[PDB]
Design a protein around this ligand. Structure first.
Ligand SMILES: *[C@@H]1O[C@H](CO)[C@@H](O[C@@H]2O[C@H](CO)[C@@H](O[C@@H]3O[C@H](CO[C@H]4O[C@H](CO)[C@@H](O)[C@H](O[C@H]5O[C@H](CO)[C@@H](O)[C@H](O)[C@@H]5O)[C@@H]4O)[C@@H](O)[C@H](O[C@H]4O[C@H](CO)[C@@H](O)[C@H](O)[C@@H]4O)[C@@H]3O)[C@H](O)[C@H]2NC(C)=O)[C@H](O)[C@H]1NC(C)=O
Ligand SMILES: *[C@@H]1O[C@H](CO)[C@@H](O)[C@H](O)[C@H]1NC(C)=O
Ligand SMILES: *[C@@H]1O[C@H](CO)[C@@H](O)[C@H](O)[C@H]1NC(C)=O
Ligand SMILES: *[C@@H]1O[C@H](CO)[C@@H](O)[C@H](O)[C@H]1NC(C)=O
Ligand SMILES: *[C@@H]1O[C@H](CO)[C@@H](O)[C@H](O)[C@H]1NC(C)=O
Ligand SMILES: *[C@@H]1O[C@H](CO)[C@@H](O)[C@H](O)[C@H]1NC(C)=O
Ligand SMILES: *[C@@H]1O[C@H](CO)[C@@H](O)[C@H](O)[C@H]1NC(C)=O
Lengths: 130, 128, 112, 130, 130
């Protein structure tokens, strides 16, 4: 491997950028290090940092992906979203090119992942009722 | 998902050299190899060789290593995923046996076991 | 010609039927240690990638074309013949860091 | 199913309201969209939102329920908490009626769930010590 | 057991202090209960509380330990970190004495745990690709 750094594979293939996720998983929250200009403006930025982060953790939690960097689910890939082959995606276009093609259907997928999780712990609720 | 227009049909005589261009568009020129293939009157098709617009690396058949002059420029980026590049082609010891139609070809993928496979072809250039 | 990778010389077919083109050679260019790519090639014009890596089709390639590669020879089938199929087909053996080793060619007729 | 909405089953049975949890799991944190009246008062409300949310995630984490919408545990149901039948609860009273009857014992249960988890990863700690 | 309290085993053995983790897991975030001196200074402290807490949850998430109080991993114990016996640690020195001896190598270990998790969900990604 080569430590490309933060967003080092932004122009690389989705198969190469998918193996370096814990690099952008650290610097998404950074860390730790009173009334003036930047003082109030720094605290406003520190709050926004944890809000956007908890939204991505809350969304991951209600999908059953809480704690996963790569998470497999039940929702099948609808051909209307992207009728592209598996080899022309992971070894071709980048994650930036991918988000533009899925920008439309990305809201429908987020709802399919939620009920696919609620209708899984509810099934397991009956699976442990005996 | 872009075009690869070439030069015209320039006809010379044996012993000389011919320059063939290949102007790309509609795709990131530095992300895919540029293969060169010809179909001469005497054989079928023959793979000449490809070159990497990113690594600048060459790999060509031994039947054309001591004849082919193969170079590329540097893309003029249009957008984030679009650019405009150029691939050049020249031969050395020319004969009437090399008479045929020549085209460039953009590589297949950006990774894997078929990274350079000629996918998107040009239009054709008739030689001597 | 000096193609070490032979094919099927020529073949004929009819509308609504399926064809098959062979592609084999010696142990130096075939087969289980090399990928096989098939190319539709009108006479001296713009080619087209039909199949790459033995059996994988290119983007937009119709589900009619199929592929198979035994230990001895690779086959290109053309299921359900349509009239616009008359052309010449070529195969190529390659690896990840090599070049295309093309074949002899096979003219396919759909006259029906 | 019928998309009743946020808190749509507040007056419905505990068995019907338990199958629509990811609806109130989203809007508990909402999201994203500098010195005046509402400005300071908005930032005070944005901080309180993530604090009450992380308390419910911290409590869920120390119970082994981190990531669960329905979570099964080891603590047996004490009859002193509610000596009611299973059918007279899930197909009768609502979650609002349930919280009033359990408001007393709800603190004892929260402690029983904590040590029931610590005496589970400690048992599994010995289970993987060989 | 004896409810020693918050940090009650700070001077006790690492084997005794390791069985009372949910005690310091609660009071790390405490909880809930506008322009003056302490007012601005309280909100500055309330934000810092959730930031240091989410860093320890983000670090636990990218290690595969999200939700664990005791978490077992794959990284083997390098003798250069501490060439001490298992009995002279868990039944001798305290967690305070332990952190001083590992203060150096503690950054190398945090990187070994990250890639040990990414090269585990990536292996499981191929394990479910069939
Ligand atoms: C930026 O974007 C560019 C363009 O997309 C990326 O460049 C492409 O990268 C991919 C993957 O990294 C390349 O595909 C591989 O191609 C090699 C072929 O290289 C071999 O042969 C070359 C010619 O004979 C030779 O030059 C190579 O030797 C080394 O020396 C050169 C010196 O210039 C050096 O630059 C090289 O890097 C080499 O190290 C080499 O021997 C092929 O072997 C690969 O197949 C292997 O790997 C795949 C998995 O990747 C595996 O499935 C196979 O089985 C096999 O094991 C692979 O196909 C592609 O050729 C590059 N160029 C293009 C597409 O034009 C670049 O990586 C991006 N960088 C970043 C940082 O994003
Ligand atoms: C694909 O999505 C459409 C809506 O965009 C839906 O009507 C259809 O049933 C879906 N098909 C599959 C196979 O998921
Ligand atoms: C998304 O919707 C817009 C609506 O204007 C449309 O133009 C665009 O093509 C859609 N995206 C895709 C990938 O089709
Ligand atoms: C029920 O709770 C009481 C305390 O309220 C306790 O003394 C008793 O042991 C508990 N019984 C069971 C069966 O849990
Ligand atoms: C809870 O405690 C109060 C103490 O005043 C008592 O009145 C009430 O009945 C208790 N709750 C239940 C359900 O018994
Ligand atoms: C221990 O760590 C050193 C670096 O401090 C490293 O070089 C060595 O390979 C490691 N050995 C083991 C067994 O982990
Ligand atoms: C950590 O590094 C310092 C560097 O000054 C060194 O003095 C100290 O001994 C090191 N810690 C250990 C446990 O060796």
């Amino acid at each position: 491997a080569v430590f490309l750094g933060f967003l080092g594979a932004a122009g690389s293939t989705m198969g190469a950028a998918s193996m370096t996720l814990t690099v952008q998983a650290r610097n998404l929250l950074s860390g730790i290090v009173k009334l003036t200009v930047w003082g109030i403006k720094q605290l406003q930025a520190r709050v926004l940092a944890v809000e956007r982060y908890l939204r991505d953790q809350q969304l991951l939690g209600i999908w059953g992906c809480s704690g996963k960097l790569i998470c497999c689910t039940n929702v099948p890939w609808n051909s209307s979203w992207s009728n592209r082959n598996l080899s022309e995606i992971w070894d071709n276009m980048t994650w930036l090119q991918w988000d533009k093609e899925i920008s439309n259907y990305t809201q429908i997928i987020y709802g399919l992942l939620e009920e696919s999780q609620n209708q899984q712990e509810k099934n397991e609720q009956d699976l442990l009722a005996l | 998902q872009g075009q690869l227009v070439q030069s015209g049909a320039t006809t010379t005589k044996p012993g000389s050299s011919v320059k063939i261009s290949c102007k790309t568009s509609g795709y990131r020129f530095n992300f895919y190899h540029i293969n060169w293939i010809r179909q001469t009157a005497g054989r079928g098709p023959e793979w000449m060789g490809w070159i990497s617009p990113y690594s600048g690396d060459k790999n060509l058949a031994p039947a054309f290593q001591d004849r082919v002059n193969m170079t590329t420029d540097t893309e003029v980026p249009v957008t984030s995923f679009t650019s405009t590049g150029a691939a050049y082609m020249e031969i050395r010891n020319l004969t009437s046996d090399d008479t045929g139609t020549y085209f460039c070809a953009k590589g297949l993928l950006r990774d894997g076991s078929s990274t350079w496979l000629p996918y998107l072809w040009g239009q054709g250039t008739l030689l001597t | 010609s000096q193609s070490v990778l032979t094919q099927s010389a020529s073949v004929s077919g009819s509308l609504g039927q399926s064809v098959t083109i062979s592609c084999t050679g010696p142990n130096s260019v075939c087969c289980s240690h090399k990928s096989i790519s098939w190319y539709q090639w009108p006479p001296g014009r713009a080619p087209t990638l039909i199949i790459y890596e033995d059996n994988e089709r290119a983007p937009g390639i119709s589900p009619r074309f199929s592929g198979y590669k035994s230990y001895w020879s690779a086959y290109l089938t053309i299921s359900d013949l349509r009239p616009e199929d008359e052309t010449t087909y070529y195969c190529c053996s390659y690896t990840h860091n090599s070049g295309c080793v093309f074949g002899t060619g096979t003219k396919v007729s759909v006259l029906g």
